């Protein structure tokens, strides 16, 4: 059913193909969901991208909180705090020795 470290699994390598992977490590890692004032959203945001208050030091904003967010072009947009998504991530390793931190079962089993 569910995964632990040392386990063989199948997940995508950076070359774009699926390979055997051994999960070397498990980390919980949190993302932020926001409501951009342009009617779009994002839930794959790192806490550091909320520039209006320190969330990496004090925790998520209040829900519905007005917030400033550095988008992936490093430019700062107005949003509105939706939610904080605590996800279990999986660091795997391939035979060439590469390694990627990953989600689902984006590590199939």
């Amino acid at each position: 059913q569910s995964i632990t470290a040392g386990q063989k699994v199948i997940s995508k390598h950076k070359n774009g193909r699926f390979y055997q992977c051994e999960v070397v490590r498990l980390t919980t890692e949190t993302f932020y969901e926001v409501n951009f004032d342009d009617g779009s959203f994002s839930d794959n945001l790192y806490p550091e991208d909320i520039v209006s208050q320190d969330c990496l030091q004090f925790g998520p904003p209040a829900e519905g909180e007005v917030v400033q967010v550095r988008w992936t072009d490093g430019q700062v947009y107005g949003a509105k705090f939706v939610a904080s998504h605590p996800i279990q991530m999986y660091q795997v390793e391939f035979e060439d020795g590469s390694q990627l931190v990953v989600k689902r079962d984006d590590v199939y089993t």
Partner: peptide, 7 residues
């Protein structure tokens, strides 16, 4: 809402 890839 939409997913967001702009810029």
């Amino acid at each position: 809402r939409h997913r967001k890839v702009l810029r």
